[PDB]
Amino acid sequence: STLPQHARTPLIAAGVIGGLFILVIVGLTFAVYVRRKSIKKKRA
Amino acid sequence: STLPQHARTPLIAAGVIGGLFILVIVGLTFAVYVRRKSIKKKRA
């Protein structure tokens, strides 16, 4: 279906979406990569 | 994915741009925040 040439706010939308999604992967990747080590890290 | 009526690649464009730009700030912010400390950090 996708969106037409002139939609509500596709341009801006994609922008915010990318930054979030992209950050989600990178962020988690870091928190996960470290866990693989587990060396007296900060955990409650 | 396909394309809209009359548009090159605005949607996708903004997407890649956001993820990159957003990462640029966050990434640098980290490398900068640490530098402010300067305490036997990892540097070649």
- The 3-state DSSP class for residue A7 equals coil
Distance CA A43, CA A39 (A): 11
Look at residues A8, A16, A9, A4 and name the one whose alpha carbon lies nearest to residue B15.
A16
> Given an 8 Å threshold on Cβ–Cβ distance, is B15 in contact with A10?
no
> If contacts are CB pairs under 8 Å, which of residues 17-36 in chain B contact chain A?
17-19, 21-23, 26
Burial class, A23, CB count within 10 angstroms (exposed 0-12 / middle 13-18 / buried 19+): middle
Tokens representing residue A34 in the block: 């470290």
C-alpha pair distances (Å), A33 with each of A36, A44, B21: 5, 19, 23
> Given an 8 Å threshold on Cβ–Cβ distance, is A18 in contact with B23?
no
In the DSSP assignment, the letter for residue A5 is: S
List the determination method: NMR
On whether the CB atoms of residues A5 and B7 are closer than 8 A, the answer is yes
C-alpha pair distances (Å), A35 with each of A14, A22, A28, A30: 31, 20, 10, 9
Look at residues A8, A14, A26, A22 and name the one whose alpha carbon lies nearest to residue B1.
A14
CATH number for B24: 6.10.250.880
Tokens representing residue B4 in the block: 């809209």
Domain of residue A23: give its range: 13-35
